[PDB]
Symmetry: D2
Subunit: 155 residues, 4 copies
C-alpha cells in the first residue's frame, strides 16, 4: 500500500500536517508529492517547499516527501499507487460530525472518516430522491441495483 | 483492516453500491452497517433493507452487511474498526476531478481519491490565507508547523 | 418584490431565524412557506410548526408565514414570485468569509453575501481551468463569452 | 439597490456571465468589481480584464464594470452597497435542484434561488439535530428561538 498526497505546499500549514498525520495511518507508505506549480507563481521555491515539508514531517516514519514537475497520474504509476489523498475545502455533514465528536472522547474514540466524492451521475441520486419517485409511480430503474428493482417497483 | 460503511439504505441506490465497490477495494473486510433509523420512519423495514443490500452486494466477496439499532461508535469498537466510510453529498474540487478523469482512461487509470474533512480549526487555514498574513506582516504562528515558522516569519 | 423561503421547520431553529432575518432585508415582502412534508413524518403538526414560526417571526414586519401542501413552483406563481431563498448546509469559501468578518466590525460593516449555485455545465468552468487549457493550446471556445474568445485564443 | 460582484476575472468565463446575468436581475445597479489581484500574478493585465468583462457585459444595461486595487469593504461603502454577490464552487442541494429544474420548464418557470451561507454557530444547528436532542431529553435552549423553547422542552 502506497498512498500519494499531492500539493503545492506554499507553505505547508497545520491543515496539511493534519491530513498527512491522518492519511499516513492508512498506508504502508505515504508519499507527499510537492508539485512545482510554476503556473501558480509560488512564494517559496520548489526546493524550499520540499525541504520545509520534509522538516515538518520527519516524525512520521512512513512518510517520504518528493518533488515533481507534473503528470501526477504518471507519478502514481511509478509508485504502483492507485489511491490519492486530498483535503476537502468544504465543511459539510454537520450532524454526522457532531455525533463523531461525542464518540471521539467518551465513547469508542479516535475514529477516522474517509469521504468519497460521488460520480457525476450519482450525485443526483439519493434514497430520498428514489422514495419520492416511487411515491409518484415514476421510473427509478436507472437509480437502483437491478437485484432490488423488482422488489420496489412494478408495471 | 476493517472499515465500516453505515447508513439507512432506504432503499440501497447505485450511489451506495458505487461507494461500497470503491471502499471495499481498501479494506480486508468492509462491514456495511444498516441502521434501524426508527426516527427517520423508513419506507422499508430493517429486515427488508438488510436483505436488499445483502442481495445487491453478494458479488463483493469481502463485504458483510449487518443490521444494528444504534451506537455506531460501539459497533466500530466491536469490529476493532477505527475507520468509517461516508459518501459526500457535495460535489466540489472540480478542476482536480477534471484532471483525474482525463488520467482515468488515457493516462495512468482507475485512480481513487480519498477525501479528508478538515477539523473546524483547520478549515480556516490555507496556504493562500497564510501567504496573505505573511504579506501584511501578521501573525501566522498558530497556522503552520513550528519547524517552519522561523523560516517564513520574524520579529 | 416578493421572496419565498420554503421549509419544513420541524421545529424552527436559530439558523432559520438568521436566514429569515437576512433575507427579509432584501424583499418588500418575505413569505415563509411551511410545507406539510407528510413524507418526512414531522415531529410537530403542520399547525404547530406554522404557529411556532409565526410566533418567532412576528418582530419581522414584512414577513408573512403561510402553510402549504406542496407544489412550491405554483405557490411561487400565486405570489408573482421569481426568487426563492435557501440556507446552505455546506460551509465553504473560507478565505473570503474570513476577510468579510474583519470588514464586518472595523471596516465597512454588516455586508451580506448572496450565493449563486452554478449550473451543471458551469461548475466545471473556472478561470484557472480556462488558463490551463489556454496554456496547453486547447479549445476553450465553449467556456468563455464569444466577445472575448478571439482575444485569448487563435488558430 | 446596488449589488457588487467582485472577482479577478482572469479571464471572464461563461460561469461569470451566468452569475452577472442572474444577479443583475436583482439590483437597480450591479457593479462588477475587477480586482487587480497582483498577488495571484494574473495572466491578463488589469486593463485587459476590465475591458474584456466590459465587452462581454455591455448587453446588461444595468451593469457597470470598475477596476479596483483592494479594500472591497470600502469599495462597498463608496457605492452605499450592503450586498455582495458570489458564485459557489460547490454543488450541493441536489434533490432541491432536481425539483427546481422540473418546475423551470413545465411548471412555474425561471425561478432563481439565492443561497445564504450559515454563520459558524448555525452550521451545527438543524431541525434534525434539535429533534435528536429533544428525544434524548437534552438541552436545545441555545439552538431555537426563545419564543418556542417552552413549547418543545421542559424541566
Amino acid at each position: 500500500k502506497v498512498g500519494i498526497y499531492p500539493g503545492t505546499f506554499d507553505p505547508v500549514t497545520n491543515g496539511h500536517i493534519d491530513i498527512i498525520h491522518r492519511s499516513s495511518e492508512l498506508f504502508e507508505k505515504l508519499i507527499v508529492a510537492v508539485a512545482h506549480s510554476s503556473a501558480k507563481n509560488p512564494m517559496f521555491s520548489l526546493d524550499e517547499r520540499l525541504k520545509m515539508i520534509q522538516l515538518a514531517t520527519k516524525s512520521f516514519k512512513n512518510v517520504e516527501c518528493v518533488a515533481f514537475e507534473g503528470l501526477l497520474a504518471y507519478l502514481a504509476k511509478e509508485y504502483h499507487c492507485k489511491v490519492l489523498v486530498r483535503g476537502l475545502r468544504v465543511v459539510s455533514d454537520f450532524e454526522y460530525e457532531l455525533q463523531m465528536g461525542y464518540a471521539n472522547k467518551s465513547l469508542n474514540h479516535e475514529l477516522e472518516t474517509l469521504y468519497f466524492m460521488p460520480t457525476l451521475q450519482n450525485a443526483f441520486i439519493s434514497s430520498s430522491i428514489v422514495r419520492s419517485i416511487i411515491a409518484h409511480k415514476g421510473d427509478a430503474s436507472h437509480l437502483v441495483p437491478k437485484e432490488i428493482y423488482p422488489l420496489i417497483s412494478k408495471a
